Structure 1
Amino acid sequence: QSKPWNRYRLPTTLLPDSYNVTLRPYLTPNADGLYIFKGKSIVRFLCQEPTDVIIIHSKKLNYTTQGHMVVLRGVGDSQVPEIDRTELVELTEYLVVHLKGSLQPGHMYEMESEFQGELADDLAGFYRSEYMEGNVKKVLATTQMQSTDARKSFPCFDEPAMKATFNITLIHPNNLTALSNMPPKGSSTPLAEDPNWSVTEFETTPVMSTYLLAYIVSEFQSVNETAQNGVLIRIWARPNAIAEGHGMYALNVTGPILNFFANHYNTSYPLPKSDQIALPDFNAGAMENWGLVTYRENALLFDPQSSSISNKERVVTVIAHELAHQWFGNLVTLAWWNDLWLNEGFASYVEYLGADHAEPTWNLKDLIVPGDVYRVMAVDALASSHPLTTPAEEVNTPAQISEMFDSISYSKGASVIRMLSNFLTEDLFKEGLASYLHAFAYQNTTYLDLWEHLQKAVDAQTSIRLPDTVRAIMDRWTLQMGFPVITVDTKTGNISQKHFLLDSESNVTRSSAFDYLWIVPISSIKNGVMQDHYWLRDVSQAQNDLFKTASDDWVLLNVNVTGYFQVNYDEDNWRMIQHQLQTNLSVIPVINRAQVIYDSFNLATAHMVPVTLALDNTLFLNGEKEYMPWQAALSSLSYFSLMFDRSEVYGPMKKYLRKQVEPLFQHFETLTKNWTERPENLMDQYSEINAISTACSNGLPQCENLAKTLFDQWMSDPENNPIHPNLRSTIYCNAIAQGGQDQWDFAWGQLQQAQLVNEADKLRSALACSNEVWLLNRYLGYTLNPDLIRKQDATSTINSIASNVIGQPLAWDFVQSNWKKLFQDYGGGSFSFSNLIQGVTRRFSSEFELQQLEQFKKNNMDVGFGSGTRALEQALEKTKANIKWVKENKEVVLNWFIEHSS
């Protein structure tokens, strides 16, 4: 029998009731350069089953407790056994307390410890974050427990189902503010031992998981609102950020979002207050700590003067995402990390709903389709994908837990939950969701519990009828990887499903309990009129007259792409859809206008339609005003540009795209009143952004003229930038491309003096658009200078230069030559050799370029490749796939573009 302290999962013999935790960060280094924090904790736990060992999580903590590493007491009049010894077991991250007798069922115990750890700049546990305010380097103390780092801050039963209440106290410099999950109990009091420090106690948390604790000590300030029901809302940030008003947008949307969710969930916001804090360089992006949500600055803050509308959209949706969790995930918590997909999937879906409430004119709900659905299908249409579900007993180690946090969990999770709500109807979905939240509040669940409560709601009504149980249906979508292509022969109405793979030669080796058959909800529209809903059962082939069509009629499946699948038709039906989009595109919903483009390019990749059919599906775009279908085209074609932009194919490609986008350019020229005023709603603003991007990058002279005029205007008056933030990336890029060292040097100056990261990013990126070899090389020569280019930006800047057809060889030459610099920067901060390699080799599509990559590899005899080792193999493999794709497609594609470019 194995010793329990060598098992990764905690015993269930002991369960925590409540913790006191007092943490004291020292924000002044100890002069060997070391920052520490000190802590003291008491955990009260209950014995469920007799045991003579206490096993609790501890990670990178030194114990200074008097006697053993802990002191153990009985609660009330319980006796306690004597401690034999305490030991730390590093591998399974345990503090192990061996006793001289057994704890007794039903008795409670208190275990007290004193400890310290490094306050490292490592974004894990209780950690430090360094940033600049004017001349001074500032340091704050903050937390990130997700997933298994609570134990790095204090000893705890660090699994999500083992919930307890927490009484947090912070000891901090008396001029800093302390924040935690809950409000402070009252005013801070001086630390008696040293009144330069103050003590801030917080109110007891609800019963909650350790991974959701947070506590922060900083100089931060806030903007505030008190909601109608007394809930205090604050946005926290650097003093200078607050004074500039950068917190206002987040404050604006937070109250409406909380309101939306309380109603959506049929459950009151379960806390007295809501803090959200913008942290500089918080690399984890955001974290849903209950009552104190952390964000990277650029995710939470918004500067109206310099920020694009896409920035605004990022803020409202990330807020909606994190706040969603304040019920789903935090109030009701998934019992184990194998079900992370339900938590993160759910939030990734409802973030659109919450944000839509905040910005109801923006049509934000549509964006899940490009943003999650088609995004994740790119990776879920591979043989190397994996099911949403993982057996709980395969997920044990902190590394295994971290692997749960991927595209499949978030984006496919979101996609399938969205499908589920749609086929249930939202009213029904909300009923079951409410039922589930009420039943399990302050406890833990599996995804089976949600299905069960949804089934209850289905069973409690007569209007929605399903072909099987909620569980049986969702099993198809959760227990096996991938999704089907649904193919329709409209001559007969025969409809079929098969597991969709982009690589039609791929072998799937992952077996499925269902033989890769799904139970598929299929909506359809015929001649622009909604049809009865249909379910495809778990069969390869079926027939329904719903999908049978006359010779003039057309049918289209999966309205708004609510279903997690792609659709193919016979060629005749494709043509009728094409004629429709040619003649009155309004008849087909805008999302489906995009779908036709998305699906057909994937189908073409998979050899299920010819590539010319996918291209034909772009022909209608010359009359398309809306964002999504154009985005579908541009996303699908970016690979074509990547493969062909050094080839004879490019001329006709540019020409075709100029033809298509010109009318849209003209449309916006008039609509915007000579570009003086942006379109009102988000989608049209996005469409304008892309139309100007597409026009300019494909050499529409009108756009080229506009870019030069605005950049000239800016250069004559540097303090008054005349370019609207929406348009900056294109206008900067195109204008530097047309210009020489005057435009480049000016933008360089602007970059050096930029105070905002997103404006800096745009400049850095546009600078790569120069058409002068000497400028691009000189620029490369800067990328390794941390005085001129931030290290964290070096590989990014190199990639942007690689992106320039002219900068391709220069960047490639630069990376090969300075490869001897992994052994400066696999020790001096990561880099991402991996993302650098992929970017610079992305274009490679010939035998000759492969012979080059192979020759570059023969620097194996030392330095190696670091964190980018594996991505070098991927480059070699991707190049082979590129060589084969270009040989298959070059002739067909060239002659299509020639034929259609006038």
Structure 2
Amino acid sequence: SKPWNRYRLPTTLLPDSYNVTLRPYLTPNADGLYIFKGKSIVRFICQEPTDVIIIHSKKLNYTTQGHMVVLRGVGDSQVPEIDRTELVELTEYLVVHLKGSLQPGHMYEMESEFQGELADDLAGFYRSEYMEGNVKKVLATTQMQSTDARKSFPCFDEPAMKATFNITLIHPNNLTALSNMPPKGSSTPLAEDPNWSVTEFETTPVMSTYLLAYIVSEFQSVNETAQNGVLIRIWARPNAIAEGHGMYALNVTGPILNFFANHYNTPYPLPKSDQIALPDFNAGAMENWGLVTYRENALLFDPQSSSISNKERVVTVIAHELAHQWFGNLVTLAWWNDLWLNEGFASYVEYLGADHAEPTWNLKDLIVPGDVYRVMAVDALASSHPLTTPAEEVNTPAQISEMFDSISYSKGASVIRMLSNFLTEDLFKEGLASYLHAFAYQNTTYLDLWEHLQKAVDAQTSIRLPDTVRAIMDRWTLQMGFPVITVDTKTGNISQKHFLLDSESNVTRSSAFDYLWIVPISSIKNGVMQDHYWLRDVSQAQNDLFKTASDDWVLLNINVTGYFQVNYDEDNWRMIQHQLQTNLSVIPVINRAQVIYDSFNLATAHMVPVTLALDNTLFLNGEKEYMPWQAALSSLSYFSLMFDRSEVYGPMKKYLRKQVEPLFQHFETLTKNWTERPENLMDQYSEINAISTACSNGLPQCENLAKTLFDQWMSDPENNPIHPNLRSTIYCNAIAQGGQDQWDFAWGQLQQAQLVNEADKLRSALACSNEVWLLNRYLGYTLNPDLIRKQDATSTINSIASNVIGQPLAWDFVQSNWKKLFQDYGGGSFSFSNLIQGVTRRFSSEFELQQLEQFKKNNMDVGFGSGTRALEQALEKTKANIKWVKENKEVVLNWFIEHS
């Protein structure tokens, strides 16, 4: 095959530098089409002779005189004539056929004039439309990530083919231009038309095409300067800067950059950091070097309405993207098969960098619930895959997009956290710096990081490993999943096997290592740290570390640094149960959560009885902390999904009423009758949860608290007395006890609500009514754009259906109106996949399964839009629910009655 029919560029030509000039036309040509025009010069060097130049180019029309490009040699160098220039749409190339051959060592210059659509497609140079008062606003902006730089100018669009960039923006004279670097001086008017200005930027460092940004907008900024001269900014809409919504972002940014310079032991590699908050940026955040983009809602904070988990969301999201300004942007993985390393690393260090920024919080631990047990859910299936793909299997752009998933991000973060711990942080940082210094401004594989990490381990004696860093990490990176470690504390025998939540699963993917790992096992005996231990690549082993006496106990994986789950024999489970029931402080708080999360998974797997899982929740009546309570609530939400319309819900609610009441009393005292919030994050979280859990399980005191506070608010609309933290539980539980006086009030608020995060709580709360007629009225309002935004409709319908009274109303509403695929699939995508997956989440009977097969029957026409085969996932899921409910409804019921 010809080289223009392969997806990977040649390596015969390498870029040195590009001059790129873009001119976006923010006012359409009256046909309705917005466009941009560009000019580009790329200077590249020749490595081996070639008579063809191949460069990426996507949805660009060339307007160059004669051929699609003009070509020159730098200095005294001469260049062959062009024979022709073709576009090849499939592999996204511009091809320049030459009448002779480029020559090794010579630099050449390629020049193009072009234009494309300035579409609202969140790819390449694109447009974004927002509303400032009456007026329509239209900005230009970029998302290059993955393979879209080539959509904006022609370039050697692969991550390792790095170069310098001289960016110019030609824009309307009263707008501001931003790019990766500072602007060169002052904008000056365009000679041919002085309504336009021309802003030139300082030349970039050597960098990859996918990290470019340019933005033309009205935005303004709050600014700060660190002592070391680095100019920091938060850019947003004019009305948003004014309200001080940029202030939290500006406050944490400095500290975060400081933390990472010390952590990476390398200084921020650029003169400034712009961070910009864009309306409707649905990729969420993009770590463009020196110009990081966020959806507006994620960056911005309003402290008078936002809860602590908005605040925690802002700081972590900021820490993630700023971590990339070194690891990712300064040192760059060579190809998209290694994206796990880049995104995993960031996904892990986001916690460290934010822990520093809010010093008295302890954010670090939140990786356990938020990432580790989250990904474990999907990595303990047979449909999973290993972190590494071979390079030669990732070629197309669609294949490249498949790299951006839960495994890449969260398991990446999880094995890297594990790696760091077993080495120790100090050792981890040593080889981490060694990697950056050595590779700065160049490209790497994950093998390069291991080699440097090896170098640091080799350079000391204290920390000893069963094998090389590569051999150990090959077990976590080349095969999918993770082990379950079983411990018989009678003999001290210890085993391992690939853990799968379905005990009847058929793993078809085969591993070089036959699902055997090398596993770091930290251990605690009667509350006291033991020697660290390594389980080798064997199914069975024995060690006296794990042998218990009659009245000793043993617990594995401290702080759940290891990426595995633990099962012990029944005697040791009970000793741990007694221990937690009598003095919970002897077991660290992450492991009080572990014992819960792990046993529920071990139950689903038929490796313990489900009653054992439920026994591990018993100690919670004494538990003051976030994470144990969180583990129980997450593990029990499926139970609630299957049983909230059955005989089981009574004994269940009564059990949670009994367990959470002491914790509610505690916060009534600690907060001084709900007037002032707890000190740190973890305790505010525990509180938010205790109130939530009290109210939904129908404790009389939380019910009373809500009615009060919502009444105080109704007699004084302008002075909201409910702290932001507690609003979603108060709002929901007071609309439930009330009727149309409380519902019509909150709908008056939601229609007038300015902020997105208030409106989300109001919408969700409006779906907690127990009046059938209100919910059916609400469902009617979801398909009216004036009342409910198109993009909120399916969200809103799900909130209604989450309400048990709402389940049959939503199902009838979906089924009936389903035909409006052909207004909201050509009316917009509409997320049919999400709607169905939510409205049918509960279905757990033979009768309901037939109703889904019966709904299915209108195959003719309609189709399912995108959510075709999320309807098969429903039917599959439904079968698996029926089967689970038969096996469990009996024993669960007895267990809850027995313990309430």
TM range (shorter): over 0.9
**Deviation at 1:845?**
0.3
Q: Note the alpha carbon deviations across 1:379-437, whole angstroms, 9 max, x for none.
A: 00000000000000000011000010000000000000000000000000000000000
**Deviation at 1:680?**
1.1
Counterpart Cα distance in 2 of 1:578 and 1:364: 27
Counterpart Cα distance in 2 of 1:832 and 1:324: 32
> What does residue 262 of structure 2 align with?
263
**Deviation at 1:551?**
1.4
**SS in structure 1 opposite 2:770?**
coil
**Deviation at 1:359?**
1.0
Q: Note the alpha carbon deviations across 1:155-196, whole angstroms, 9 max, x for none.
A: 000000000000000011111110000000101101111111
Q: Note the alpha carbon deviations across 1:827-864, whole angstroms, 9 max, x for none.
A: 11111100100000000000000011000101111111
Counterpart Cα distance in 2 of 1:480 and 1:615: 32
TM-score normalised by structure 1 residue count: 1.00
Counterpart Cα distance in 2 of 1:360 and 1:875: 45
**Deviation at 1:137?**
1.1
Question: Alignment length, in residue pairs?
Answer: 900
> What does residue 146 of structure 2 align with?
147
Moved more, 301-310 or 821-830: 821-830
Counterpart Cα distance in 2 of 1:124 and 1:710: 46
Q: Note the alpha carbon deviations across 1:481-516, whole angstroms, 9 max, x for none.
A: 000000000011100010000000000000000000
**Deviation at 1:10?**
0.3
**Deviation at 1:7?**
0.5
Counterpart Cα distance in 1 of 2:240 and 2:578: 53
Q: Note the alpha carbon deviations across 1:653-710, whole angstroms, 9 max, x for none.
A: 0000000000101100000010000101000000000000000000001000011001
Following superposition of structure 1 onto structure 2, how do residues 25-424 of structure 1 map, counting pairs within 5 Å? 25-424=24-423
**Deviation at 1:582?**
0.3
**SS in structure 1 opposite 2:30?**
coil
**Deviation at 1:30?**
1.1
**SS in structure 2 opposite 1:73?**
strand
**SS in structure 1 opposite 2:215?**
strand
**Deviation at 1:281?**
1.0
**Deviation at 1:201?**
0.4
**Deviation at 1:298?**
1.3
**Deviation at 1:559?**
0.2
**Deviation at 1:714?**
0.7
Counterpart Cα distance in 1 of 2:823 and 2:505: 40
**SS in structure 2 opposite 1:897?**
helix
Q: Note the alpha carbon deviations across 1:87-119, whole angstroms, 9 max, x for none.
A: 111100001111110100111100000010111
Identity %: 100
Q: Note the alpha carbon deviations across 1:437-477, whole angstroms, 9 max, x for none.
A: 01100000000000000000000000100000000000000
Counterpart Cα distance in 1 of 2:23 and 2:547: 71
**SS in structure 1 opposite 2:781?**
coil
Counterpart Cα distance in 2 of 1:735 and 1:829: 35
> What does residue 729 of structure 1 align with?
728
**Deviation at 1:227?**
0.7
Counterpart Cα distance in 1 of 2:693 and 2:32: 51
Counterpart Cα distance in 2 of 1:777 and 1:762: 19
Counterpart Cα distance in 1 of 2:875 and 2:611: 28
**Deviation at 1:630?**
0.2
> What does residue 21 of structure 2 align with?
22
TM-score normalised by structure 2 residue count: 1.00
Counterpart Cα distance in 2 of 1:168 and 1:608: 60
Q: Which runs of 5+ in 2 are unaligned?
A: none
Task: Say whether 1:704 aligns with 2:703.
Answer: yes
Following superposition of structure 1 onto structure 2, how do residues 825-840 of structure 1 map, counting pairs within 5 Å? 825-840=824-839
Counterpart Cα distance in 2 of 1:23 and 1:549: 71
Counterpart Cα distance in 2 of 1:259 and 1:66: 50
Q: Note the alpha carbon deviations across 1:209-235, whole angstroms, 9 max, x for none.
A: 000000001000000011111000000
Counterpart Cα distance in 1 of 2:718 and 2:34: 42
Q: Note the alpha carbon deviations across 1:9-32, whole angstroms, 9 max, x for none.
A: 000010000000000111111111
Counterpart Cα distance in 2 of 1:896 and 1:30: 70
**Deviation at 1:77?**
1.1
Counterpart Cα distance in 1 of 2:676 and 2:550: 46
**Deviation at 1:620?**
0.4
Counterpart Cα distance in 2 of 1:746 and 1:137: 30
Q: Note the alpha carbon deviations across 1:19-54, whole angstroms, 9 max, x for none.
A: 000001111111111111100000000010101111
**Deviation at 1:360?**
1.7
Following superposition of structure 1 onto structure 2, how do residues 432-581 of structure 1 map, counting pairs within 5 Å? 432-581=431-580
Counterpart Cα distance in 1 of 2:195 and 2:53: 38
Counterpart Cα distance in 1 of 2:243 and 2:527: 50
**Deviation at 1:635?**
0.2
Q: Note the alpha carbon deviations across 1:287-335, whole angstroms, 9 max, x for none.
A: 0000000001111110001000000000000000000000000000000
Counterpart Cα distance in 1 of 2:317 and 2:268: 18
Counterpart Cα distance in 1 of 2:226 and 2:85: 49
Task: Say whether 1:586 aligns with 2:585.
Answer: yes
Q: Note the alpha carbon deviations across 1:771-828, whole angstroms, 9 max, x for none.
A: 0110000000000111110000000000000000000000000000011001111111
Q: Note the alpha carbon deviations across 1:344-368, whole angstroms, 9 max, x for none.
A: 0000000001001101211100000
Counterpart Cα distance in 1 of 2:553 and 2:642: 34
Q: Note the alpha carbon deviations across 1:711-732, whole angstroms, 9 max, x for none.
A: 1111111111111100010000
**Deviation at 1:524?**
0.6
RMSD: 0.5
Counterpart Cα distance in 2 of 1:837 and 1:241: 36
**SS in structure 2 opposite 1:199?**
strand
Following superposition of structure 1 onto structure 2, how do residues 741-780 of structure 1 map, counting pairs within 5 Å? 741-780=740-779
**Deviation at 1:267?**
0.5
- Segments of 4+ in structure 1 off by > 2 A? none
Q: Which runs of 5+ in 1 are unaligned?
A: none
Counterpart Cα distance in 2 of 1:554 and 1:30: 76
**Deviation at 1:207?**
0.1
**SS in structure 2 opposite 1:236?**
strand
Counterpart Cα distance in 1 of 2:29 and 2:656: 62
Moved more, 508-517 or 26-35: 26-35
Counterpart Cα distance in 2 of 1:279 and 1:738: 39
**Deviation at 1:739?**
0.6
Counterpart Cα distance in 1 of 2:141 and 2:721: 39
**SS in structure 2 opposite 1:5?**
coil
**Deviation at 1:761?**
0.5
> What does residue 896 of structure 1 align with?
895
Counterpart Cα distance in 1 of 2:752 and 2:86: 54
